[PDB]
Symmetry: C8
Subunit: 30 residues, 8 copies
């Protein structure tokens, strides 16, 4: 359904935020 699919897109966007925060960790380590 389109609502569950839109919530899945929100989950994917939150995973992109997590990946960006991992990139911040890597930048701090350097």
């Amino acid at each position: 359904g389109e609502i569950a699919q839109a919530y899945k897109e929100i989950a994917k966007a939150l995973k992109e935020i997590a990946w960006a925060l991992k990139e911040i960790a890597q930048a701090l380590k350097g």
Copy 2:
């Protein structure tokens, strides 16, 4: 539908937050 479309706009906004966090990572790497 307008509700699923509004949730998709929330997902797009969350992706923009991820992009901004990546810009923070790049600024720290410099």
Copy 3:
């Protein structure tokens, strides 16, 4: 509808958060 319009306002507010995080990146670059 008023609910979809309120979700659109939440998306706009999340975009403002993304813009503020971009401003943080610019501040770190300086």
Copy 4:
């Protein structure tokens, strides 16, 4: 309606988070 109004209060709170992040940017620029 009370639900749409409550979602609008969530949007206003998210905008306050954006303003606070801008204050962080300004503190880093100083």
Copy 5:
């Protein structure tokens, strides 16, 4: 209603996050 009241509590909690981020800005300024 109890659902709108619970969303209002979420908005108040997001405002507390904004205030804490303002406290971070003040800490960086010092």
Copy 6:
């Protein structure tokens, strides 16, 4: 009701995020 109670638990968790951000502010002030 169980849904309003679950939303209240989300608000409490968001308040814990605010408290944690205040601990970050205090760590920067030291």
Copy 7:
């Protein structure tokens, strides 16, 4: 119910974010 249980899992995940932010505060204090 499965929806209230899923919202409870979201609250638990937000508490994990708060704990991680407390870990950041501890790292800054050191």
Copy 8:
């Protein structure tokens, strides 16, 4: 159900944000 499953994916994504924040803490401790 697909909606509860989508909310569980949002919780998992929020947990990934917590893990990423822990990686930030570890980078600061180094």
